[PDB]
Design a protein around this ligand. Structure first.
Ligand SMILES: Cc1cn([C@H]2C[C@H](OP(=O)(O)O)[C@@H](COP(=O)(O)O)O2)c(=O)[nH]c1=O
Ligand SMILES: [Ca+2]
Length: 129
């Protein structure tokens, strides 16, 4: 996989963020994770976490996987990085996302994220508390 440049437009929630990519505004849905909705428990925490990460980053990068790049809602599907650190993995490691939505064609970092989830779960973090 390869990392591509993008710029933050707006934080949205734990697992969606609005970026400018190849010069076009686009909502991105984070691959392989599921954060609680803002109205659910840990939803506010997940939004705050992703917000700080993308807002504090001097460099945002988008990394598509091998399958479809857009979902049925028009959202881009990618791994998102903030100064080199993967937001998707970071949310899981903190127990603010579950590994989820593992689809056949777009699963490259699956075992990486499950390792992070095992450690968050081991540590009883947030969702796992
Ligand atoms: C993460 C991801 C979600 N989706 C779709 C599946 C779900 O369909 P449904 O809307 O029919 O539930 C929806 C869940 O995303 P959200 O968790 O943002 O709601 O987005 C994909 O198709 N591919 C993906 O890689
Ligand atoms: Ca969600």
């Amino acid at each position: 996989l390869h990392k591509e440049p993008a710029t933050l437009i707006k934080a949205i929630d734990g697992d969606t963020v609005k970026l400018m990519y190849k010069g076009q505004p686009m909502t991105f849905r984070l691959l392989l994770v599921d954060t609680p909705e803002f109205n659910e428990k840990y939803g506010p925490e997940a939004s705050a976490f992703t917000k700080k990460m993308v807002e504090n980053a001097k460099k945002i990068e988008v990394e598509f996987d091998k399958g479809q790049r857009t979902d049925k809602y028009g959202r881009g599907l990618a791994y998102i990085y903030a100064d080199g650190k993967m937001v998707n993995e970071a949310l899981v490691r903190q127990g603010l996302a579950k590994v989820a939505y593992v689809y056949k064609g777009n699963n490259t970092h699956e075992q990486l994220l499950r390792k992070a989830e095992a450690q968050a779960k081991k540590e009883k973090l947030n969702i796992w508390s």
